[PDB]
Design a protein around this ligand. Structure first.
Ligand SMILES: O=C(O)CNC(=O)C(=O)O
Ligand SMILES: [Mg+2]
Ligand code: NI
Ligand SMILES: [Zn+2]
Length: 331
C-alpha cells in the first residue's frame, strides 16, 4: 500500500506531464497521495498562470466577510459578518494597514504560533467565494476555468445527464483569515492555486480517519452537534493542532506559497489560515474514484449549510433516499 503513514506528498511534474490533468491526478493517487487528504503540486518552471497581476485592483469584493470568533484560542467558532463592498485595491490597502497587517515574525513556525495564540482576539476580513478566474485564457495546462465538469464526469461514469454548472471562485485573504474544518460539498475534490501574495497554511486529516475528527468535533461543540448531525458542513468550527494532538487525531500540515497548487481529496478534512494579503482560485472537481464518496457523503439538512444550484442533482442521483430531507433544508 503506497503512503501508508498518509503523509502530504509534493509533486514536481514536468511540462510534458502537465498536459493531461486527469492523468496526473491518477498518477498522484498511484503513489498514495490521496491517503493524506491533501497534496502540493509545484508547476514546471516553463508554466505561468497569466502574464502579470498588475491589473487586478478593480475586481469587486461585493460582500467582504468579517470573521468574528467565539470560544477559546484552540477551540472556537467563527461567524461571518457582512461588510460593505470594496475593490481588491481597497481590500489590499486594508490588509496592509496597521490594524490588519501581518506582525513581525521570524519564520512560518513563529507566525503559526502567533496565529493560534491570538486569532480569536481579532476579526480579519475575508473576500471569499467570488465567482471568477485569474487564469489567462491562453493558459492551456491546469487552467482551473477549463477543467472537465463534475456533471460531465457523472454522465460519463453513470450515464445520467444532469443540469448544473461548475465554475471557479476567487479568495482574497489577509492575515488571520481562516477556513474552518470541512470536506468539500458531496466530498468532492478541490484544487486551489495561490495566484499571488503571502502564504496559506493548511491542516488536513487523512480520509481514512475523518470520522475521528467528526467525533472530536461533536465532543468539542456539543450544542452544534445536537443541532445538526453534519454540522461541520456549516464551515464554522476551528480546532488547533495542539488540541488535535492532545486528542490523538491524525493530521498533517503544510504551507502553500504563491505559484503552487494544492489538491484536496474526497473526504479529506482541511482547515487553515492566510499569512497576509493574498489571492487564491479554487474549484471542485471529480474523478471516477469520487463517485463512491459522493454516494456516502453526509449531509446537513438543518438549513444552515445552504449551497449551490448544482448540488441538487448530485444528491438527487447519488443519494435519492436523502433527497427529500436535504431539499427541505435547502427550502
Ligand atoms: O482558500 C480557502 O479559504 C479555502 N479553500 C479551500 O477550502 C479549498 O480550496 O478547498
Ligand atoms: Mg482590475
Ligand atoms: Ni475546501
Ligand atoms: Zn446543519
Amino acid at each position: 500500500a503506497q503512503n501508508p503513514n498518509c503523509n502530504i506528498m509534493i509533486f514536481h511534474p514536468t511540462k510534458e506531464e502537465f498536459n493531461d490533468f486527469d492523468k496526473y491526478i491518477a498518477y498522484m493517487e498511484s503513489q498514495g497521495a490521496h491517503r493524506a487528504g491533501l497534496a502540493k503540486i509545484i508547476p514546471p518552471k516553463e508554466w505561468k498562470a497569466r502574464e502579470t497581476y498588475d491589473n487586478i485592483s478593480e475586481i469587486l469584493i461585493a460582500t467582504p466577510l468579517q470573521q468574528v470568533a467565539s470560544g477559546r484560542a484552540g477551540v472556537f467558532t467563527q461567524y461571518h459578518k457582512k461588510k460593505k463592498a470594496m475593490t481588491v485595491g481597497e481590500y489590499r490597502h486594508l490588509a496592509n494597514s496597521k490594524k490588519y497587517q501581518t506582525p513581525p515574525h521570524q519564520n512560518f513556525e513563529d507566525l503559526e504560533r502567533k496565529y493560534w495564540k491570538n486569532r480569536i482576539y481579532n476579526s480579519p476580513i475575508y473576500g471569499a467565494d467570488i465567482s471568477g478566474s485569474l487564469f489567462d485564457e491562453n493558459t492551456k495546462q491546469w487552467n482551473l476555468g477549463h477543467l472537465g465538469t463534475i456533471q460531465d464526469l457523472l454522465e460519463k461514469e453513470c450515464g445520467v445527464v444532469i443540469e448544473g454548472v461548475n465554475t471557479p471562485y476567487l479568495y482574497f485573504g489577509m492575515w488571520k483569515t481562516t477556513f474552518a474544518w470541512h470536506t468539500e460539498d458531496m466530498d468532492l475534490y478541490s484544487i486551489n492555486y495561490l495566484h499571488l501574495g503571502e502564504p496559506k497554511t493548511w491542516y488536513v486529516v487523512p480520509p481514512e480517519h475523518g470520522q475521528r475528527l467528526e467525533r472530536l468535533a461533536r465532543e468539542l461543540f456539543p450544542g452544534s452537534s445536537r443541532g445538526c448531525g453534519a454540522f461541520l458542513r456549516h464551515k464554522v468550527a476551528l480546532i488547533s493542532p495542539t488540541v488535535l494532538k492532545e486528542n490523538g487525531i491524525p493530521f498533517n500540515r503544510i504551507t502553500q506559497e504563491a505559484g503552487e497548487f494544492m489538491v484536496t481529496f474526497p473526504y479529506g478534512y482541511h482547515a487553515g489560515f492566510n499569512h497576509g494579503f493574498n489571492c487564491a482560485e479554487a474549484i471542485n472537481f471529480a474523478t471516477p474514484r469520487w463517485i463512491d464518496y459522493g454516494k456516502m457523503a453526509s449531509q446537513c439538512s438543518c438549513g444552515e449549510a445552504r449551497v449551490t444550484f448544482s448540488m441538487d442533482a448530485f444528491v438527487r442521483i447519488l443519494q435519492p433516499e436523502r433527497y427529500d430531507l436535504w431539499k427541505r433544508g435547502q427550502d
